[PDB]
Subunit: 184 residues, 8 copies
C-alpha cells in the first residue's frame, strides 16, 4: 500500500506530490558466506501527481532508492609463513676456531600463522538509485520488483533508508522518505 | 517566509534581486550511527526579480545550497593481532650444548589489541549546490523540499551556511547568505 | 525447461513477465591448473511477455547473467634467495690486530626458500551480465550456449546465482532468480 | 568608485581601456573555525571601453578576480595510542628456569598522545577568476556582489590582489591591478 | 578439416551453427630466448550457418581466438653491489686515545651478488580474440593464417583453448570449443 | 621601440619577418612573501610582415612569451613534535623485583623542533606563451600589457628570455629572441 | 628481392597473398653511447595480391613491422654520498664527566661511492608497426626506407623478426615472417 | 646548402625524394645555468620532389627534427638538517638515582649537511619533430629558423641527429639523416 508521501507547492505554483508504495527490502543470507557482507532485494513503486497551472505539460525525473549506513569498516588478514633453516654470523670472530659459529642468527625455526583484524570508522552515508527515469504529464508511473543490492567490509549493523524523488525539468524537487530496514 | 535578500545594479543597468525563502536545514541522528558522521535535510526556495531595461528577456542561472565547515578531520583504527609461538636463535653458539637455545627471540606471547586515533586540521570550507538551473524572464522561480546532505570523518562541530545565487547569462552575479545552522 | 519466473504489474498497468529457461552453469577443471581459479560455461534462455495496454509497442532491455560470491581472497608467494659471502666490521678495533676481524657480520651463509600465504576477507558479491540487449514488442526472445566465465584468487567455495532481468524503456523492471550452482 | 584603470593602444590601433570599480574583499571569521583557514567575499565591477577603428564590432572577454599568496603551508596531526600489555622473550634461555621470563620486551605500558606540526614553503601565487565572460561592442559591462572565496592550510598572512582583464578576440590584452587586501 | 561445431535454436527460432576449421597453434622457440616466455602462431577458420525464419537478413559478429592459462607467475632479480671502504664510530669514546677508532662500523668489504626469485599464484584465465568482425546473411565466412601471440613471466606450463563464437545482432550467441594445445 | 627582429625566406618564397617591440618584464616583490617565489608582469608587442607571392592570403599563428630557467629546486620543512611520557620494558626480568623497571625505554622527554632543507638540480628550461593567436594577411598585429607570471620553489636566480614566434599555416616558422631579464 | 611470402584461401574464396621485399634492418652504434641501448633503421616493401571473386573491390589494411625480444632488463645506479661530521650520545651518562662523550655515534667519516646493478627477466616479446595503411583493389602497394627504431635497458642480445600483414575489411588475415636480424 | 638526400621508388612507381638544407643546431649556454642542462636552436629546410605517375596529385606529410641521446641520467640532492637537543632514556633504571639519566640517547648535536648524487643509465634515444605538416603536389616546401630545444638531468655528452621525413598519404615513407651535432 501507500508507505509515505510528501507534497510541495513549487516555484511556479504547481503542487508536486511524490509517493512510495509497496516497499520491501528483503535481507538474505549472503551468496559469499562472508560475515562482513550484506545482501538484499529491493521491491517497490514510485508515483507522482502534479496539479495546478501547466500540470499536463510537466516534464521531470522519477527515482526510487535507498541510503545505506554502517558504523565500522572491518578487514581481516591471516598469514602463514615458513623460512628454511639458515645462519648468519653476528659479531663473530673469524680469525680462530670456531670461526664465528659461536654467535649466529637464524630465521624463525618453526612454521607460523598470524592474524590481524582492523576496525576503523566507516565510509559514511551512501545513496543508491534503484532507477532514475524521465516522466512527462500529470500522473505516473514506475515500479520495481527484486532489484539487487549488496555491501561488504561492514560491521556494527547495516541500515537502509528507502526514498522516492521527483525532480521537475524546471529545477524543483521533493523527496519522501520511509522508515529504515535493518540488515542486521 | 523571506529569510534574506540582496540586490545589485548590474553592468547593463538592470536591478537583480536574489532571495532565500523558507530555509530549513534539518540535522538528524546519522543512519550509520557513526559519531564522526553528520546528516541533514535541506528545504527552501530561491526567488529572483529583474527590473530595468530588457527585464523580460533576462537569461540566467539560479542556485540554492550551503557551505560546510568543521575544524578537524578524525580517524580511528583498532587492531587485533596474534602470532603463533616461535623461536629464532640470536647470538647463539651452535657448536655445543644447548646449541643456541639459551639465546632465543620469540614473537609476542599473548593476543593483543591496539587503538590509534588521528586528529588533523580539517579539509577547509566546501560548497554544495542543492540545485543549479536555467531561468528566463523577469521573475521566478525554484523550490526544494527534503534534499539530503552528509559528511563523515568530522570533529569539533559542523556548520552549514545557506545561500542563493543568481548568475546572469551576461556574467553578472549576486548571492545572498543566511544565518548558519549548527549540526553539532 | 522453465526454471523460474516473476511477474510485475508495472507503473502504467502492463503485466511484465520475465523467465529463465534451460539454465546450465558447467564448472570445469581450470585451464590454468590453479587451485585458486574457478572456470565455467553458462547456457540458458531469457524470455519475456508483456500484457495489457500498449503491449505491442513495448520497448525494453533483456539481460541474463549471474552473481558470484566466495568468502576469502587468497594469495601465495614463494621466494628463493642467496647472497654471496661477505663481511662488515661491527664494533671492531681497527688500531691493532686483528683489525676488527674478531667482530664481523655476514649475510645468510646458505641459499634459502620462504613461503608466505595471505588469506583475507573476499571482494563481496559481484554481478556479471552474459548478455544485455534491446527488445521490442509483446514477446521474446534471447538464448545463449556455452558463454565463458572465470575468477581467480578465490577460496572457501565459489557460488553462482543465475538471473534474468527485464527493464522497460519506461524505467520499470522485474528480475527473476534461480537456485545457485556450486563451483566447489 | 573607480579604483584603478589601464589603457593600451592595441595591434590594430584600437585604444583598449579596462577598469576596476567598487572593489571590496570582505574577510570573515571562517565557517570551519580553523586557524589555518581564510574566508572572504568579493564584490566589484569590471568595465571596458574601446575607441578607434572598428570599435563597434569589438569582440572579447572580460574577467574579474584576484591573486592570492601566503608564505607557508602548515599541517597539524595529533595521535592517541594504547596497546594492551604483552611480552616477547628477547635473548632468553628457554632450557631452564625461569625460561626467558628474565629477559622480556613489552609495548608502551601507558596510553599516550603525540603532536606533530609541519611547516613548509607555500604553494606559490595562485589566480582565481570570479567571472570570465564574452562581451561585444564598444562599452560594458559586468558586476558581482558577494562572491565567495576560501583557502586552508595557510600560515604567515594571506594577501589578495584584485585585477580586471580584457582580452580581445584578436589576441590583445590589458589588465589593471588594485592595491592588495590583507586577510590576516 | 572440421575440428568442432555447436548449434543453438535461438530466441526467434533460427538455428545458429558456429564451426572451427583447420586450427593450428604453432609453439616456437621464443624470440627473446627467455625461459618464462611463450610464443606461438594461430591459424584457422571460423564458419557459421543460419537456418529458419529470416535466415537471409541475419546480422551478427564472428570471432576466433583462444583462452590461455598457466598456474604461476615467476620473476627473477639479480643484484650486484659494492660500496667503497668507510668507517663510522659506534659507542666510541672521543675524549681520549684512540678516539673511538676501537669501535667502528664499516660497509660490506667485498663486492657481492644476490639472487631473488619470486613465485606466486598466476593471473587466472585470459581470453584473446584473433579477429572479431561483422557478418551478414545466411553463411560465411572468415579465415586467418599465422596470427601471432605471446605471454611472459609464466611458469608451470601454458595451455591454449581455441574457440569460435557467433553473436547475433539480436543478442543470441553460441560458441564452440576445441581441444587445448600445450605450449610446454 | 623595436627590440629585435628576424627574417626567413620560407619554403614557397615568401619573406617572413617577426618582431618584438616595447618589451618589459617587471619583477615585483612576491605577493606570498616567500623567498623561493618570483613574480612578474610581461608587456610587449609582436608584429609580423610577409612579402613575395601570395603575401595577402597568408594564414598563420603569432605568439609572444618567454623561457624561464633557474639552477636549483629548494624546499624547506620544519617539524614540531612532542610525545607524552611513557615506558616500555626492554630486556627486563619480570619474575622478581623491581619487575623490569630497572630497564625501561622512554620517548623523547622534551618537545623538539627540527629543520630540513633540500636542494636539488632544477626542472630545466620551460616555455610560457603569453598569447598565441591566429592572424591572416600581410601585416599585424598583437599587443599585451601587464600579463602575469610566477614560479616558486626556485633558487640560484631566475632568468627570463623573451621571444616572438610566427608560424605559417603552411608549416614554416621563424622566432626572434631578446636579451634576458634577471628576476634575482 | 622477394624475401618471403604466404597465401590464404579466405572465407569467401579469394586467394590473398602478402609478401616482404628488400628487407634491411640496419643496426648502428647508438646515438646515446649507452651499452644498454640498441638502435636501427628499417627498410623494406610490403606487397599484396588478391585473386578470385570480387578481387577488384577488395578493401584491406597492409602493415610492415617487426617483433623484438631480449632476455633481460638491466639497470645500473651509482651513488656518491658524504655527510658532515656529527655526534649523538648513545647510552651515555649525562650526570657526570665526561657527560656521555665516552659513548657517541657518528655518520660515515669519509665520502663514499656505491654501485648497484639489477638484472631481471625481460619485458617479453613486443610488436612494432613501421606502417599500417588502407589499400583497395587487386594489387599493391607500399614501401619504406630508413624508418627508425630503438630500445634501451636491454641485455643478453636483441633480436628483430620482420613481418608483413594483410587484413581484409572482411576480417580475413595472413601474415608472412622473415628470418630474424641480430642487433647484438 | 644541400646537406643530405634520399630517394625511394615507392609502391606505386613514384620516385620520392626528401632533402635537408641549411641545417644548423646552435648550442648555447643554458638559461638555467645548470650543468645538467643542454639548450639549442634548430634552423633548416626540408624539401621534397615527386616524379612518375600521379606526381601532381601527390598528398603527404613533411617533417624536420632530430633524435637526441646521452648515456647517463644524473640528479644531485643536498640536505641541511638540525634537531633541537633532547634525551630519551634507553635501558635505564627508574627506581633509584639517577633515574636512568646515566643511559640516554640524544639526536645529532650539531647542524649537518649531506650530499647525494645518483648516476643511472639514460632514458634511451628520443625523437623530436620541429614541424610536421601536410603538403600536396609535386614539389615543396618548408623552412624553420631558430626553433628551440632543451633537455636536463643529462650527463656524458648530448648528441643530436637531424632528419627530414616525407610520408605519402598512401603509406610510403623515406627519411634522410644528417651528421650529428655535439652539444658537449
Amino acid at each position: 500500500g501507500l508507505d509515505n508521501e510528501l507534497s510541495l507547492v513549487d516555484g511556479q505554483d504547481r503542487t508536486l506530490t511524490v509517493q512510495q508504495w509497496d516497499t520491501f527490502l528483503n535481507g538474505v543470507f549472503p551468496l559469499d558466506r562472508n560475515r562482513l557482507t550484506r545482501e538484499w532485494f529491493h521491491s517497490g513503486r514510485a508515483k507522482y501527481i502534479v496539479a495546478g497551472p501547466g500540470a499536463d505539460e510537466f516534464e521531470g525525473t522519477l527515482e526510487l532508492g535507498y541510503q545505506i549506513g554502517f558504523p565500522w569498516s572491518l578487514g581481516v588478514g591471516i598469514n602463514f609463513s615458513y623460512t628454511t633453516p639458515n645462519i648468519l654470523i653476528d659479531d663473530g670472530d673469524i680469525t680462530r676456531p670456531p670461526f664465528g659459529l659461536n654467535s649466529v642468527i637464524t630465521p624463525n625455526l618453526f612454521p607460523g600463522v598470524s592474524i590481524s583484524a582492523d576496525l576503523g570508522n566507516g565510509p559514511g552515508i551512501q545513496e543508491v538509485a534503484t532507477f532514475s527515469v524521465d516522466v512527462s504529464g500529470a500522473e505516473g508511473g514506475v515500479a520495481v520488483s527484486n532489484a539487487h543490492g549488496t555491501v561488504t567490509g561492514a560491521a556494527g549493523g547495516v541500515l537502509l533508508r528507502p526514498f522516492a524523488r521527483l525532480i521537475a525539468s524546471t529545477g524543483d524537487s521533493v523527496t519522501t522518505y520511509g522508515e529504515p530496514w535493518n540488515m542486521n
